[PDB]
């Protein structure tokens, strides 16, 4: 969630006043994930035991 | 005659008193050219920005 505001210019002339603006972005968050190769032989287990 | 042939030309501000001599140490870029120094600025960022 982020609330950005905006600064405006207070004008004259032939022009109607303009209003100030928000701006209410999110972004959803992106998920991943990263994984390694790690092999242990079997006579280690054998040596564990 | 001791205080009417008065009428000089100058700012004057007689029994007057204003402006903080305090003053602002603000951040601005100065620059001499000819022989007189000159604010030299480029307002868009700070204004007209966003």
């Given at each position: 969630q982020f609330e950005v505001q905006q600064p405006m210019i207070a004008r004259d002339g032939p022009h109607p006043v303009d209003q100030p603006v928000?701006?209410?972005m999110v972004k959803r968050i992106h998920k991943?994930?990263?994984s390694a190769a790690f092999?242990?032989?079997s006579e280690a287990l054998s040596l564990l035991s | 005659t001791l205080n009417?042939?008065?009428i000089p030309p100058q700012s004057n501000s007689d029994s007057t008193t204003a402006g903080l001599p305090v003053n602002a140490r603000v951040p601005a870029?100065?620059?001499i050219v000819g022989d007189k120094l000159v604010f030299l600025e480029a307002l868009?960022?700070?204004?007209?920005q966003a």
């Open positions: 928000h701006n209410y991943r994930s990263l092999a242990i032989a | 009417i042939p008065s870029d100065l620059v868009e960022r700070r204004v007209y």
